[PDB]
């Protein structure tokens, strides 16, 4: 998590509120290097990025494979940059502390010729079932051992040439929580007590089971795509609640139910708490504590990783308590 602290600092100092994205885990760094592929996931807090293990070299027509290295000739180094670490960050082993980084970019000319290019006739099953590309990478120039005393002393040794921030461009071929939870709650209030019970019975199954969570997310999305109630479905009453009395799919219901699921993704250990509460009817109490901590440690938080975590628990508890 300290790695994330440094990565976020780099992004803020280099391009605050910009295309720049931060590497969240040091292990998956080399997979975020330029010319690499990074996919998107559905997270209401915001688009999240996960590595693919594939590269434009693996999908493009290599013209023979005899020399795929020539592509790197299109890689340019804008040079080196300096990032001034904050006070809680200390380079163990110098009153002003700073780190040196290197910027690698893909030539704009190759970006232009990308669209007017051919893919390989045979492509990996992963790419065959694939349906972006890293454009810029800021990486360490030398080993950096850093430590933090921030709380809400940790130590991280970033090996050299490790990607810290990355910018991606789309691959082509020839919002306030309060508002969100409000909107979701509204969508759900326009639902029968029986229907809401069905949704709850399901979302409670989702508590503590990533299997059931992914299954119900996939199925809500699937009957949102097809828009037709399957003859039989293991969670048929949920998707039945998705459709109105006329059977017309109210897309707001599904979108929100997925949104609840997306948030539940952000609560791994806390989930047990919510489950026990729904099992004892203490949810109201939990909702309040979440609200207190939010309001106490945060002014107009509804205007820290914990902040996002808290917003998730509020959304989850609020919806649950609203269904019951």
């Amino acid at each position: 998590s300290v790695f994330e602290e440094i990565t976020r600092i780099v992004v803020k100092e280099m391009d605050a509120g910009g295309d720049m994205i931060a590497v969240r885990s040091l292990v998956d760094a080399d997979r975020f290097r330029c010319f690499h592929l990074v996919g998107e996931k559905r997270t209401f807090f915001g688009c999240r990025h996960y590595t693919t293990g594939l590269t434009l070299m693996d999908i493009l027509d290599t013209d023979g494979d005899k020399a795929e290295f020539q592509i790197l000739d299109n890689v340019d180094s804008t040079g080196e940059l300096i990032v001034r670490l904050p006070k809680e960050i200390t380079i163990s082993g110098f009153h002003h502390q700073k780190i040196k980084i290197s910027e690698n970019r893909i030539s704009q000319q190759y970006l232009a010729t990308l669209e007017n290019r051919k893919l390989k006739r045979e492509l990996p099953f992963s790419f065959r079932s694939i349906n972006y590309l890293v454009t810029e990478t800021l990486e360490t120039v030398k080993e950096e051992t850093l430590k933090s005393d921030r709380q809400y002393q940790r130590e991280v040794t970033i090996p050299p040439n490790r990607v810290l921030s990355y910018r991606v461009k789309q691959l082509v071929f020839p919002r306030n929580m309060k508002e969100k939870l409000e909107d979701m709650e509204s969508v759900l209030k326009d639902l029968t007590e029986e229907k809401r019970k069905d949704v709850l019975n399901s979302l409670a199954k989702c508590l503590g089971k990533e299997d059931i969570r992914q299954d119900l997310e996939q199925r809500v999305s699937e009957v949102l795509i097809s828009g037709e109630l399957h003859m039989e479905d293991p969670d048929k009453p949920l998707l039945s609640s998705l459709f109105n009395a006329a059977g017309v799919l109210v897309e707001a219901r599904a979108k929100a139910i997925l949104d609840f699921l997306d948030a539940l993704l952000e609560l791994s250990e806390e989930q047990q708490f919510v489950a026990e509460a729904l099992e004892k009817g203490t949810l109201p109490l939990l909702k309040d504590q979440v609200k207190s901590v939010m309001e106490q440690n945060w002014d107009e938080l509804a205007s820290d990783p914990e902040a996002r975590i808290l917003c998730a628990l509020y959304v989850v508890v609020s919806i649950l308590l609203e269904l019951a």
């Binding site: 100092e13 605050a16 509120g17 804008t78 040079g79 940059l81 001034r84």
Partner: protein
Amino acid sequence: HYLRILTEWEKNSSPGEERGIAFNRLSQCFQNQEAVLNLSDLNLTSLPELPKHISALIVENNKLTSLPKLPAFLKELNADNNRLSVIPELPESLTTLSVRSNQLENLPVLPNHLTSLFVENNRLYNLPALPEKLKFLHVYYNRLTTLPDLPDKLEILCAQRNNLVTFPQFSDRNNIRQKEYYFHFNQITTLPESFSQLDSSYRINISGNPLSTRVLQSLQRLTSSPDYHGPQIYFS
């Protein structure tokens, strides 16, 4: 025959100075008429006279405070991670000048054939006349308040973490190529209408700056129009 002086410099290696390695490195370049002189990572507190033939000197990661005269044929100068208080005259041949991680408060006159200027992590208070040949300029981590008028062929401009209060005047689209300018974390409150006339080739980050609510509304209205194909802009 400053080779003896080179030796003397070595004999004057204060505890910690790896002057001997440099002595060998300098001698090698002189005897072999080499073109690359890099005395970085040698704990040097001073530099002996440099051969006039070299056009690239790399002396970063050292404890230098002032630099000897630069060969009139130099084209790249790396003095980062040094305590330089001032930089000697710049040869018109110099095309790259990087002296970041230093204590420079002012900069020497800049040749017009310079294309790269990296002067970040300094105490610079004002920048010299900027040559048009410069495509890249890094002036961040400084105390600047007034950026000089930008050149026509400026591709990258990292001017964040400064005391800038007024937005700079552009070349008025004298360049039609992609351009990334960073002005975040600077104390700016208002902006010029000239921005409204810039193409989408311009990428500007003004986030963090104390911009006025009026501009925010204006810029928010501009970024919410399909007809608006103006410069990629960021704010916060």
